[model samples]
Target chain A: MGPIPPTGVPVGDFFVCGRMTTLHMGGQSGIQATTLVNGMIYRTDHPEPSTSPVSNWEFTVLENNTIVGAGMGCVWFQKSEALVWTLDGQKLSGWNTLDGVGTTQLTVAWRQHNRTIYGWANVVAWNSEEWHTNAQPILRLTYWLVKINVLSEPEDFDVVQKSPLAYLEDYTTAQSKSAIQKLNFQTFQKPEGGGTLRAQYSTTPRQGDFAVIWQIGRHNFDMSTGKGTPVESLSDYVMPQQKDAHIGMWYRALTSVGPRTDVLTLHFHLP
Target chain B: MGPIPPTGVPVGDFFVCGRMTTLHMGGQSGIQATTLVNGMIYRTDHPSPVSNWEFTVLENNTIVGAGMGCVWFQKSEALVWTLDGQKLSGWNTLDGVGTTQLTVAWRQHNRTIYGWANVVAWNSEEWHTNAPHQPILRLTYWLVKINVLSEPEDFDVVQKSPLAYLEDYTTAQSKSAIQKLNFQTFQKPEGGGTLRAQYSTTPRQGDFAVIWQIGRHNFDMSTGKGTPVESLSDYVMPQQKDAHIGMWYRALTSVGPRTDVLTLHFHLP
Candidate 1:
């Protein structure tokens, strides 16, 4: 009858692709699991059927949005929707997933209605099994259910206090309520050369924290030589204080650090 | 002079009760051909750009166009309102039924003067039937065609390249973002110029549950002399060399809609 409003959840840096299902065949399949570079692995030894006796696969979300497991058999298999949530200390939800298998499929990137907000990676399924002993290749899907989680207003004055996105509000804040947060796009680097971008936070930022870099006025300078791409998915999309010093941040814009297109850092917010 | 007067031309109305028969009733027509609301149809079997098809409106109205819901190529079919080659558009689901998709971005851009006999009506079968001595037209899709009046660039100045900034905040329920949302027209380093600001939500809101306000201000240090926004969702304000240009927004209340908000800030130098 009216505008079907979204749950106003802030999107996050990481597109969490949860392993929503598994196949059972009693030692029929080979490796049925979600392995991660973040030192976490989830594998299904038994064939967990889809949504029957409640194959509750909706709880898992791949943090790297698929670049981490793009080649290593990582997919957001089987779930009508994944509830959008904020990353542990920011202001947005990963409401929409990236194209599955983040790196290769799209020349002009797009989304899937059936897919959730996590960046679905390149490799759709793990068929490296005993082709006969393994289960049928299921069409992997992660539906995006609009479960809006509204972060309650924090009593103290913390600028980064917001829902789904802003987690881990430490004591460094509240020294000043409106502790001015400003991250400016210093310079951009493309991988053809050595791609890098300096996110110069204006305030003398509290070290040991990270700020997810977002953009304004796109870096859409798609030239043969010059390039402006999305902030790297895995490598340096989210700026960590340990990577750089207190002055600001600068890092390589590569998901996997090869001859990939360099990314641009426009005027960033959040000091 | 007083408030920027919109080019007011009364609206024109039409119906697509399965067949479109208001302007060029045959296959298709140009922006010319007929004076039926000074109108024409953009009905080509394939995707054709709606060229200098000008807009005529009474004040400013968002004209939600009517069409069959299906895909173009494999992608979802979208109704695009292109201005100066940039697009302010939306897409439709591939449901294969008569649909009147929501109109476009910018209250200024959403224009055309047209009305409807019936807002909408449809039947899957032949359009020739179902009208039992029809008292009126039972159109599949009925809508108002709004128009763009005079250009905002009516002022005398050299045409300068526009600077546009797009920031996407993740849709989470937190009012700190609501309080911190602001833009300064004269913020140096980025330099200063005339500005126009717009904010749109995904999963469009027809009757806004969120009560919001956006207006210009005169920034004096941290304090601002506020000016109320009277009309227009997307409003343009000049860089007052006499004063400072402060652009900001405030919301009275919000229903925690998981809608992500993206604000577009434009600077006309």
Candidate 2:
């Protein structure tokens, strides 16, 4: 009536196959175990054997440790049409026995058609000395499932006072809320001296007793006045001087800054 | 008639003002040579008695330190003026002793003025001693004097060549020539194989050597081969068979020869 509505067919039922069996073999006598024979028979030139036991009538799917695909039940290895697996994504492969039970938990997002959903993830079952098939063929098609609901905002967050040791407050900072930071070319502004610098002391710097060096230019404080005023008043990169008599300060130049070539820095250790 | 000529009064009959008058000293108790008559001669104040010697009363045209001038003779000093003694070109001054032997030199140039000229330029004489006064009355009046005429430019003749070791051909080379010499950079392009770079050694190996690793690039040496053709030439930054290896050769981007930067010079003894 209407293209013979196949009600229960999973996505794997779509594939058709040619029934001619070709016997490919390795080793001299051709008297090897059927495991090796079965490998060559279905895989042909492929060095790895097809693990899909349900490759019988309508579907063929494989998972193997030596191959690029995910070799666990209900685990669909996301591969391009050219059949190369996306190894860079969260995936794993390791040692497994040829005929034994293996247990590995891999978070697998199902793929089917054109949809991908992470909510319906599954704990895949892995086998070692056994064969696997697409018996649960509908599982291979999970990529088609669209994620229904996702939390747009994070949970369990709190706002704290901006610390005085922030290198940059106005602009985006690399260390975010991390305190007692070190100054680097990437974290500080050019001409990093003068009013943009600060000096201070603190017994507790980062939930602990420490010191910090940050640039003031990073703060959203008014650039003109922020540069001239003492940096401890919001517009600054500050240092919390502890017990050491030796004080350290952050400074910025109004003009050109470096990456100054030929600048020699020497550290002196006094006895 | 018109501005009558002045009369020539003969100076022979002029009255002498009591030459050698004997003054009668009224009371010279014992006429000893006492220098007493000091104030009787002058009214109040006047020139010293010695200044009276400066006064001269001679008739018109009396010779001064001019023309073949006057003479006052003493026992030893005889003043005489002649062309051979001294010559005055223009106005000059003459000193006179009370009665001295003197000679006056003539000041005549248009006709013939002859006296003495210093023969040796820098020789010292009594005349040269009074060099400040320069003895205008002495034996020489230099019409034109010259000393050390051309001492300054004596070295200009036959100029010798400068030391060639410090010249342009030696040290300071042009940029074009510097590129030709390849003192730095301008590395040789490479292709294939792990190209190894080594500084050249003329005699001793590893002398002046800087070792560098190189990458791969194709090379073209095909211009009707003198050497065998190969897909890959032996890639060497500075290949060593002998001392003539080069670290790198600059390719002329346009239409000229290239420079080479020698990692090492192949010096041979």
Candidate 3:
């Protein structure tokens, strides 16, 4: 395969809640849970073993929540592989029941965006009653999914500009197209604008759009066009009444029906 | 995390098998399985129904199996959870039971040279009899891995050469140290010319070997005599009986230990 020009789907900001587990005990012992974050470890203080199931311990990690891409899964556990669930808009909850032997590790990965909030966790069973196999501590792990976002942009556009402008010159004669060439200008903050500017130069013509702050009276010129037929038919302006009107060029002249060769001078002005 | 260098363990070369699955049917109905490769889908037709247990289907992908690496897994079926397995010797075979509701997708990847070799598919139970809920059409995927091979050679070595030579020089004043330069030479053909030339340069304290055609002649040199002595020791020769013999250089002379410097010219014929 040829080099895959660094490009991919965008994944927005998100966070991960390392590991969480569900524990239960009835006739003999109580239930206890422990969690580690940063450098400190927190645990659930001793609680007598009542008949009911203990509440599913939850931890929310927010400090490093901005994730563009990530990898997570049950590094190690028992009975059923950790149930990884995505709850509601941005909340994620995970839990595993108390049972069985033979450690199972399951994982999941994704690249996408985030709207509200999200987190992940490892769910495993911790039975203190000795009802489950030799009570061995479980290991849960998740690798932070983060990568440099690859953005597609014009290959020839200048890196620095007051306002970036991407100009695509056509191989065809000026009479064949609306503006002889296409001009796209946008800000660095614009996401998809740069890629569209590149596609405008493709051999097979394609339509694309760009937005620029317009100055009411400032004018530019195509000095190359010598004095000849008045090229007034070549220029098309939008919202003539607005102070910041946009100009759309009618590239191909309609009057020229035959192999007519005529050089013309053209100007662009706020008026 | 700090930036990780674009280096990794070399996994020589490998291949991946597309999709595999298991299917089931009631008393009178049989089983069916399908696989996709190069836009062409292959299925197990006329497979008789096995009783009590769901049919376990297997697909073995091989070209000229000389084991490198492989990945195989059960996508989805009726009874158990998805089972994914990786085989080291360039072969992937997947099989699973036929029972209730499962959607599993297993995938693996490795990097190597070659223009291309890739396949992928998804297997889901689709019964018009409304036997299975949700017309499960699983999606399977696999991408081809390719990269430049890393070879061992001097960076300046040309792609083509009759006999390649590499020399490393060290700076030290002692007779044993100053001439302690290193040399490595290899030949395009299995001939004595390349190996014989490499052993020509060595300090009185160096020994390295290279094998080529013809009889072997071992040689070494350093022409430095000890103090309180008029040292005139320099050794150089190709073949003791040959007309053109290479001369060895005399490193540090050890005559007149005090601050006395002498210069002498010697000829080797």
TM-score of each: 0.20, 0.10, 0.13
Candidate 2, B-chain TM: 0.10
Query: Per-residue lDDT tens digits of candidate 3, residues B76-144?
Result: 110111111211121111121111111111111111212122121111111011113322111111211
Q: Over the stretch B1-269, how does candidate 1's per-residue lDDT look in tens digits?
A: 12111122111111110111111100011111110010111112211112121211111242222221110011111111111211111112212322233222221224322321111111110011111332211111112222222222111111011011112211211111110112111111111221111112111111111111222211111111112121111111211111001111001000001111211111110
* Candidate 1 vs candidate 3, lDDT winner: 1
Q: Name the regions of candidate 2 deviating beyond 4 angstroms.
A: A1-121, A124-168, A172-178, A181-271, B1-269
Q: How many pairs in model 1 have backbone atoms within 3 A of each other, for residues 3 or more apart or on separate chains, i.e. clashes?
A: 71
* lDDT (Cα, tens digit) per residue for candidate 2, span A1-271: 1111112212110111011111111111212111011110111121123332221101111223111122111101111110101111111011111111121222222221222223232122211111111121111101110111222121111111111111211111111111121111111110222111111111111111111111222212122111111111122221221111110011111101111011110111111
Candidate 1, superposed: residue stretches over 4 Å from native: A1-271, B1-144, B148-179, B186-269
Docking class of 2: incorrect
Please write out the lDDT profile of model 3 over residues A179-254, one tens digit for every residue.
1111122111112222111101111111111001011101222212200111110111111110110111011011
Candidate with best lDDT: 1
Chain A, candidate 2, TM-score of: 0.13
The TM-score of candidate 2 is: 0.10
Alpha carbon deviation, residue A13, candidate 2 (Å)? 37
Candidate structures ordered by TM-score, highest first: 1, 3, 2
